[PDB]
Amino acid sequence: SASDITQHLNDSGLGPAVECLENLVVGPVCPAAVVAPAV
Amino acid sequence: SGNPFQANVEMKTFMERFNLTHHHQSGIYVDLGQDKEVDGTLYREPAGLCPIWGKHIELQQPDRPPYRNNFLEDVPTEKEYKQSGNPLPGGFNLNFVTPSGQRISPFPMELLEKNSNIKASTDLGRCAEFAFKTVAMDKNNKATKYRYPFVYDSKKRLCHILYVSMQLMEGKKYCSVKGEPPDLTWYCFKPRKSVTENHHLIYGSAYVGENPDAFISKCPNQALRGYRFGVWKKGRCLDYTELTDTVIERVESKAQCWVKTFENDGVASDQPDQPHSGGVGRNYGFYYVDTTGEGKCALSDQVPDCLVSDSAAVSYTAAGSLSEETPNFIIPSNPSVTPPTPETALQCTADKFPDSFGACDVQACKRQKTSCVGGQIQSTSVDCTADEQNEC
Ligand SMILES: *[C@@H]1O[C@H](CO)[C@@H](O)[C@H](O)[C@H]1NC(C)=O
Numbered sequence: 001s002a003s004d005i006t007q008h009l010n011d012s013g014l015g016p017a018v019e020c021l022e023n024l025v026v027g028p029v030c031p032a033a034v035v036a037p038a039v
Numbered sequence: 040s041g042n043p044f045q046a047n048v049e050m051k052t053f054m055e056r057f058n059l060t061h062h063h064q065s066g067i068y069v070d071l072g073q074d075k076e077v078d079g080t081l082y083r084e085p086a087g088l089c090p091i092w093g094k095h096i097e098l099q100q101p102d103r104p105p106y107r108n109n110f111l112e113d114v115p116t117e118k119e120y121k122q123s124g125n126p127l128p129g130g131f132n133l134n135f136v137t138p139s140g141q142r143i144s145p146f147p148m149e150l151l152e153k154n155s156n157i158k159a160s161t162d163l164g165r166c167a168e169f170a171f172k173t174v175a176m177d178k179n180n181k182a183t184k185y186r187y188p189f190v191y192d193s194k195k196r197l198c199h200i201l202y203v204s205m206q207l208m209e210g211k212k213y214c215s216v217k218g219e220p221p222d223l224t225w226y227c228f229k230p231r232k233s234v235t236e237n238h239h240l241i242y243g244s245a246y247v248g249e250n251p252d253a254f255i256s257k258c259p260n261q262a263l264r265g266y267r268f269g270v271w272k273k274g275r276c277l278d279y280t281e282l283t284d285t286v287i288e289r290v291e292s293k294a295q296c297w298v299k300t301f302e303n304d305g306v307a308s309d310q311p312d313q314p315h316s317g318g319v320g321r322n323y324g325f326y327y328v329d330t331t332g333e334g335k336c337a338l339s340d341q342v343p344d345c346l347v348s349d350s351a352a353v354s355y356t357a358a359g360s361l362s363e364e365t366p367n368f369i370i371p372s373n374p375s376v377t378p379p380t381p382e383t384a385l386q387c388t389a390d391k392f393p394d395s396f397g398a399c400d401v402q403a404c405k406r407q408k409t410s411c412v413g414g415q416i417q418s419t420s421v422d423c424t425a426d427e428q429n430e431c
């Protein structure tokens with residue numbers, strides 16, 4: 001009933017918790033402050 | 040057979056742009072066509088190859104500060120979330136920055152249109168390419184193949200990368216509407232197209248940026264004026280209103296029909312179970328005026344392979360814009376690589392293009408009439424010969 005909600009979130013496209021993105025134009029980018037983990 | 044809209048290569052090429060199953064190949068209302076592994080876990084990923092004109096995510100946050108109900112707002116920090124309380128504030132926009140503090144999103148088009156790493160011929164293509172050239176890093180700081188969707192704001196000329204790839208969330212079990220119930224983290228939200236608002240926003244997966252010039256010729260970016268989508272059967276073009284599975288709805292305006300082609304319940308959607316529509320769905324439609332003068336919207340999942348001429352009609356797809364006109368932010372500067380316009384593709388001259396009649400379709404007692412009017416191909420259905428009417 002809480003795992004189901006999680007599964008629903010994953011099924012709805014909830015993404016991975018990542019610290020860094022790599023962009024070819026501007027290089028690596030990171031959040032300056034901790035992002036809300038639920039996002 | 041003898042479908043004039045398949046008569047030659049150019050014509051086929053023109054008509055093929057309307058096959059969203061072939062070119063887009065993913066959900067449209069909700070696009071989650073691919074699966075990618077990050078840190079040992081599988082995640083769903085938007086994968087559609089065509090940009091979706093006018094698509095935005097409507098949010099249902101409370102109508103009080105600090106909530107803005109705008110999915111292009113930055114994703115919230117934990118601090119902001121703690122400060123607001125439930126539900127999550129902010130939006131879907133990626134808020135990451137370079138070590139020097141430069142935003143990756145939103146990103147101005149001026150910085151893309153003269154850059155080395157960007158080879159797309161149009162602004163939208165440049166935004167898409169910018170998105171395609173952005174990937175998630177894993178725990179070991181290795182590049183994955185997980186990419187984020189984008190929104191191009193063509194009025195502000197700003198390219199947005201969305202950190203949130205979700206597109207629909209509903210049900211009191213999962214999310215709140217205007218803060219009710221207050222125990223839930225997530226606000227509810229859904230994809231929308233509006234009769235008046237946000238026509239300038241173009242939603243896409245990163246993968247329209249994989250070949251950033253393709254969409255110009257392979258996607259149905261604009262509405263088609265003066266024609267009804269149709270399917271070629273028994274020697275003539277049947278517009279959707281002649282097909283039994285077609286959904287016909289009343290509308291006050293053509294914009295409502297355009298919205299309906301995207302928002303009706305049969306549109307290609309990957310929303311849950313992890314369905315892959317592959318672009319199949321009730322994606323096609325047109326506005327038309329009935330015999331009494333009232334506006335109607337015909338909706339179908341049949342990929343169009345012919346057209347019926349009707350000057351007051353307008354044909355839409357879930358992917359395309361409301362407007363019939365091609366905007367400059369998808370026109371390449373080099374004239375030699377622009378695709379044929381609908382006027383060009385459907386052109387004819389009366390002295391080289393003969394009026395023709397097809398054989399009688401006895402089941403409907405109608406036959407194809409194909410001709411040239413105003414330098415454009417007219418395709419209609421008319422009565423069979425008096426002789427033929429006996430067989431009906
Ligand atoms: C549309 O594309 C799909 C996938 O390529 C194909 O199976 C289908 O026959 C096409 N429909 C047309 C061209 O009407």
Ligand SMILES: *[C@H]1O[C@H](CO)[C@H](O)[C@H](O)[C@H]1NC(C)=O
Nearest residue numbers: 370374375377378379380383
């Ligand atoms: C495409 O449009 C350009 C102008 O933007 C030129 O008119 C060119 O001749 C067109 N080519 C096609 C294929 O119609």
